[PDB]
């Protein structure tokens, strides 16, 4: 969806563990954690086990962009963590083996 093809792709045969715990009081604030972001924007998609921290404006479905062009935005999008939200917008911290 979002994490694999844009942020970081994982292969589907060899992988270790997911080490996630409760960081409600650590990473979030009740009005918003606007500090950390994700990629939804890449010309193309990733291979498995691949970082991408490109601060180059791309297209969301792989279209070649020399900006200012059509469908060319920020590579990064907000998280918005609350302490007054559900579990789906609580911040956790995952350690991958």
């Amino acid at each position: 969806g979002v994490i694999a093809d844009y942020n970081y792709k994982l292969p589907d045969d060899f992988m270790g563990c997911v080490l996630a715990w409760n960081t409600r009081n650590i990473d979030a604030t009740s009005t918003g954690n606007y500090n950390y972001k994700y990629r939804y924007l890449r010309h193309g998609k990733l291979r498995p086990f691949e970082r991408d921290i490109s601060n180059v404006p791309f297209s969301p479905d792989g279209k070649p962009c020399t900006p200012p062009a059509l469908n060319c935005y920020w590579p990064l999008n907000d998280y918005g963590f609350y302490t007054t939200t559900g579990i789906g917008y609580q911040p956790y911290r995952v350690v991958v083996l």
Binding site: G44, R47, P48, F49, E50, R51, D52, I53, S54, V56
Partner: protein, 191 residues
């Protein structure tokens, strides 16, 4: 017997463009004075995405992945009458350095030789499962140009999980400045 792109370098011909890595490459180094000395494997070719530098600076095999500000002409400058390297103009900036390796200390052939090409280095680079499969082939040759028909086994030296975005790459030549200039050399893409 498949089609192999021959990027020769003569005193005017200075070629290391954006070459696609799309499946991996079969590299050949038809060398006599170690002209080809490095690569940068990346996608965006700037300081934005992660990209790895694998070079031999005639002292070390320097293996490093950062946000290198990609100089749009990466080169080594070696004085042709003197015979030593003067410059290492590869990177301008380097940040979020995610991998580092520097090999053992030595001294390599730096100055320019003449005649046939002394040795052929056969390199294979593969991005699978985040690894960078780096293979090596090496046996001596004696030829002017036109990559010879041969038979030798490539051997594993570096199973490297770099985990970065590699869709393109770019060769790192060596400019022999006697003002830039080169000597006779050739490298091969080899999809």
């Amino acid at each position: 017997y498949s089609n192999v792109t021959g990027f020769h370098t003569i005193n005017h011909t200075f070629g290391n463009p954006v070459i696609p890595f799309k499946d991996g490459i079969y590299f050949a180094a038809t060398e006599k004075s170690n002209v080809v000395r490095g690569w940068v494997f990346g996608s965006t070719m700037n300081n934005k995405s992660q990209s790895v530098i694998i070079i031999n600076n005639s002292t070390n095999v320097v293996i490093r992945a950062c946000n290198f500000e990609l100089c749009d002409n990466p080169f080594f400058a070696v004085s042709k009458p003197m015979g030593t390297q003067t410059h290492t103009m590869i990177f301008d900036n380097a940040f979020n350095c995610t991998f580092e390796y520097i090999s053992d200390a030595f001294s390599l052939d730096v100055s320019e030789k003449s005649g046939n090409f002394k040795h052929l280095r056969e390199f294979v680079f593969k991005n699978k499962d985040g690894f960078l499969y780096v293979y090596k082939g090496y046996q001596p040759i004696d030829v002017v140009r036109d990559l010879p028909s041969g038979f030798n086994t490539l051997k594993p030296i570096f199973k490297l999980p770099l985990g970065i975005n590699i869709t393109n790459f770019r060769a790192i030549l060596t400019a022999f400045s006697p003002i830039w200039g080169t000597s006779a050399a050739a490298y091969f893409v080899g999809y």
